[PDB]
Design a protein around this ligand. Structure first.
Ligand SMILES: Cc1cc2nc3c(=O)[nH]c(=O)nc-3n(C[C@H](O)[C@H](O)[C@H](O)COP(=O)(O)OP(=O)(O)OC[C@H]3O[C@@H](n4cnc5c(N)ncnc54)[C@H](O)[C@@H]3O)c2cc1C
Ligand SMILES: Cc1cc2nc3c(=O)[nH]c(=O)nc-3n(C[C@H](O)[C@H](O)[C@H](O)COP(=O)(O)OP(=O)(O)OC[C@H]3O[C@@H](n4cnc5c(N)ncnc54)[C@H](O)[C@@H]3O)c2cc1C
Lengths: 339, 339
C-alpha cells in the first residue's frame, strides 16, 4: 500500500524505518515515501544537544515513561557494535546540578549508575548544592539522521523535498496511510492549540578536554533555561534557553551572551574554547505527545492519518518507543483492511 | 645555596617547584638549576597514558598510599580554575574490567564515585565479568611538563641540557644539594639492582567520540599487559604492555598489533580511528620508590643527595606526595646547616 511519512526529523525517519522494518515482509506491496520541506542539516533534530534525558518531572501520559525506557534499551543494545559511533552513539557520564534538594527523577533506574553527588563532588561546582550523577548516552541528531537516511534509502524508501499544504493534497495523491511527523509545524496541517514552539539557541564549541555533560537547573526559571554543557562526538554544545511561544528562528545576540557567560562561569576553562557555530530551533512543545490514529474522508476515501508529534525537549530521548507505537497502530490499520 | 635537580620528567620538575615554592622566601640565596639530558617531549613522562590510578595491589611502604592521596587532592583543588586544562588536567570517568571477582582497591575512597559495575553495564563488555567504575583525573604529561616548565622558568630556575656523569661531577660544580630524579636511568649514577625498566608501547589515536577510560586487567598476564583505552585532552591513548627488563626503545610492530587488536576488540568503533603515533617508554620499576637522603663525601665536601625515583606505572599518580616529602628532607638539611 501507499504510505507517506511527512517529516524527516528523528520522528519521521525512525518511524518510517520502524514500520518498513516490520511490514515489508508481510505486505508484499509496501510503498513508503517521505515528504519533507527540510532535511538534515535543517531539521530541529539537527540542533538537538544530543543527550538522552527525559524531563525531571513525571510525564502526563504514563506511556511516555515506557517509550523512554524502550528507547534507552534499544540504544544501549547497540553499544558494542562497530557502528555505534557511525549511528551517532556513545555513552557519556555527567552531572545534573541544582540549587536545592529535589526528588529523584522517575528515570533514575533507566539510566546507568544513577546516584547523588557527594560533597567533594559538589565542591567542583560552587553555586550548586544538590545533584545527581549517572551515565547515559549521546545520540547526535545529525549523524543519526544521516544513518537512518542511508538505512531507509537502501530499503528502497523514497525521499522528496516537498512542502505539504494539507493532508487532502496527499490523500488525493493516492496515499493509503499518512504519518504526520511534522514537529512544531504540525499545526499548519491541522490546528492544535496545545502545540507551541519552545525556542532554544545553542553554541557549538570546540573544547575536547570536556568529557562529561553538566546540566544545571533553576526551578524558578524553567527547564532548560539554565546553562548546560554537553560533549558530543566532535564538539561541545553550550546551551541554556527554552522560550515558549517564541518563533524567532534567528540566533540572537542576547541569548548568545547569556548562554556563554553562564557556561563560562560553570566551566571556566571554556575561556579557551573556539566557537564553531550557533543555532536555534523549536522544541515542539505540547502537554503530551500527540500519537494517535484518525480517519479522514476525502469524498469517498477514508485515509488514515497517524500522528506523532509534540515531543518537546525529548524527541531523541523517546523516539523509538513512539516509532514502535506507530507501527502497532499501523498494524491495526492493516487488520482492518484485512492485510 | 646551590641546589641542582637532575631530571626534567614529572618528578624532577614537580620537586623543583615544590621546594622553590617553599624555600625561596626563607633562604635568601636559593639557586636552583635543573640538569637533564632530555626535556619534554623526550621524557618517559611525555609517554604516560595520563591517568591518575595507582596499582590494584597495596604498596610496600604505606606512605605511598598517602602520597597518592595527597596528589589527588592537590590535583582536584585545581579543578575549577580557568587553568586546569592548561596544566593538562580534566576529570574523566571510566571502567576497570576483570575476568573475575577481585577485592576493592585500597584507593576506592580516594577517587570519586567508586562503585562496582552492574550487569547492564557489564553487558557492554562481554568478555568481562566483574568491574568497577569511578571518576578520576587526567593529567597529560606533555602539557603538565610544559606548564611546570613555565612556572619554574618564571620563578628564575635555570635549565640545562646536560648528561650528568656522576654525582661527583656535580658536587665539584659547587652543588650544595643534589636531587636525583633520573627515573629508570638512576642506576647509571649509582647502581640499584632493584631498579628495572618496565617497557611499554602505546598508540595514540584520534577518536573523539570516546569519553571514558576503560582499563582491562588480566591477572595471569600482569598489570598493564592487557588492553586499555584512555582519552586524553586531544587524543586517545591505546595501550597494553609492561615488560620488565626490556630496554628496547624502538616501537615494535608486534606490540603494536597486539595492542591494536585487543583494543579494537574491546571497542570496535576504533575501526574508524586515525592512528596519530606510537611511542614506547620505560616505567622506572622498583619495589618501592627510593626517596631518601644520603650524604656524600668528595674529599672535604659532604654534599647531600636526595633521591626520588622508582615510580613505575604511577609517577603521575603520586608525584606530588613525593615532591612534598623531598621538600621535607630538604628542610632538615637546612636545619642541620642552620638555615
Ligand atoms: C536546542 C535544542 C536542544 C534539544 N536537545 C535535545 C536533547 O539533547 N535530547 C532530546 O531528547 N531532545 C532534544 N531536543 C528535542 C528534539 O530536538 C525534538 O524533540 C525533536 O528533534 C523533534 O523531532 P521531529 O522530527 O518531531 O521534528 P523535526 O526534526 O523538526 O522534524 C520535522 C520534520 O517535518 C518536516 N515538515 C514539517 N512541516 C512540514 C510540511 N508542512 N510539509 C513537509 N514537511 C514538513 C520538517 O521539514 C522536518 O523534516 C532539543 C531540541 C532543541 C531545539
Ligand atoms: C607507556 C606508559 C604509560 C604510563 N602511564 C601512566 C599513567 O597513566 N599514570 C601514571 O601515574 N603513570 C604512568 N606511567 C608512569 C610514569 O610515566 C612514570 O612513573 C613517570 O613518568 C616517571 O617520571 P620521572 O621524572 O621519574 O622519569 P622521566 O620522566 O623519564 O624523567 C627522567 C629525567 O631524568 C633525566 N635524566 C636521567 N638520567 C640523566 C642523567 N644521567 N643526566 C641528566 N639527566 C638525566 C631524563 O632526561 C629525564 O629528564 C606510565 C609510563 C609509561 C611508560
Amino acid at each position: 500500500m501507499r504510505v507517506v511519512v511527512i517529516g524527516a526529523g528523528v520522528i519521521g525517519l525512525s518511524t518510517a524505518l520502524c514500520i518498513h522494518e516490520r511490514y515489508h515482509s508481510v505486505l508484499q506491496p509496501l510503498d513508503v515515501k517521505v515528504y519533507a520541506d527540510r532535511f538534515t542539516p535543517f531539521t530541529t533534530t539537527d540542533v538537538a544537544a544530543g543527550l538522552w534525558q527525559p524531563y525531571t518531572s513525571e510525564p502526563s501520559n504514563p506511556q511516555e515513561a515506557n517509550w523512554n525506557q524502550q528507547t534507552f534499551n534499544y540504544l544501549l543494545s547497540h553499544i558494542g557494535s562497530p557502528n555505534a559511533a557511525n549511528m551517532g552513539l556513545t555513552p557519556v557520564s555527567g552531572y545534573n546540578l541544582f540549587r536545592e534538594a529535589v526528588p529523584d527523577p522517575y528515570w533514575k533506574d533507566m539510566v546507568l549508575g544513577f546516584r547523588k553527588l557527594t560533597p567533594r563532588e559538589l565542591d567542583m561546582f560552587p553555586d550548586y548544592r544538590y545533584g545527581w550523577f549517572n551515565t547515559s548516552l549521546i545520540l547526535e541528531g545529525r549523524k543519526y539522521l544521516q544513518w537512518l537516511t542511508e538505512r531507509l534509502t537502501e530499503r528502497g524508501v523514497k525521499f522528496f523535498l516537498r512542502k505539504v499544504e494539507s493532508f487532502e493534497e496527499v490523500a488525493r495523491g493516492g496515499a493509503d496511510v499518512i504519518i504526520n511527523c511534522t514537529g512544531v509545524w504540525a499545526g499548519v496541517l491541522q490546528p492544535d492549540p496545545l502545540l507551541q514552539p519552545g525556542r532554544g539557541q545553542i553554541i557549538k564549541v570546540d573544547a575536547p578536554w570536556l568529557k562529561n555533560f553538566i546540566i544545571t537547573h533553576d526551578l524558578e526559571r524553567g527547564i532548560y533555561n539554565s546553562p548546560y554543557i554537553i560533549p558530543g562526538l566532535q564538539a561541545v554544545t553550550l546551551g541554556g534557553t527554552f522560550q515558549v511561544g517564541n518563533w524567532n528562528e534567528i540566533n540572537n545576540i542576547q541569548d548568545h551572551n547569556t548562554i556563554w557567560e553562564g557556561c563560562c562561569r560553570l566551566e571556566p576553562t571554556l575561556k579557551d574554547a573556539k566557537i564553531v557555530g550557533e543555532y536555534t530551533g523549536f522544541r515542539p512543545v505540547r502537554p503530551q505527545v500527540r500519537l494517535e490514529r484518525e480517519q479522514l474522508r476525502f469524498g469517498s476515501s477514508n485515509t488514515e492519518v497517524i500522528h506523532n508529534y509534540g515531543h518537546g525537549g525529548y524527541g531523541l530521548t523517546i523516539h523509538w518507543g513512539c516509532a514502535l507505537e506507530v507501527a502497532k497502530l499501523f498494524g491495526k490499520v492493516l487488520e482492518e483492511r484485512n492485510l
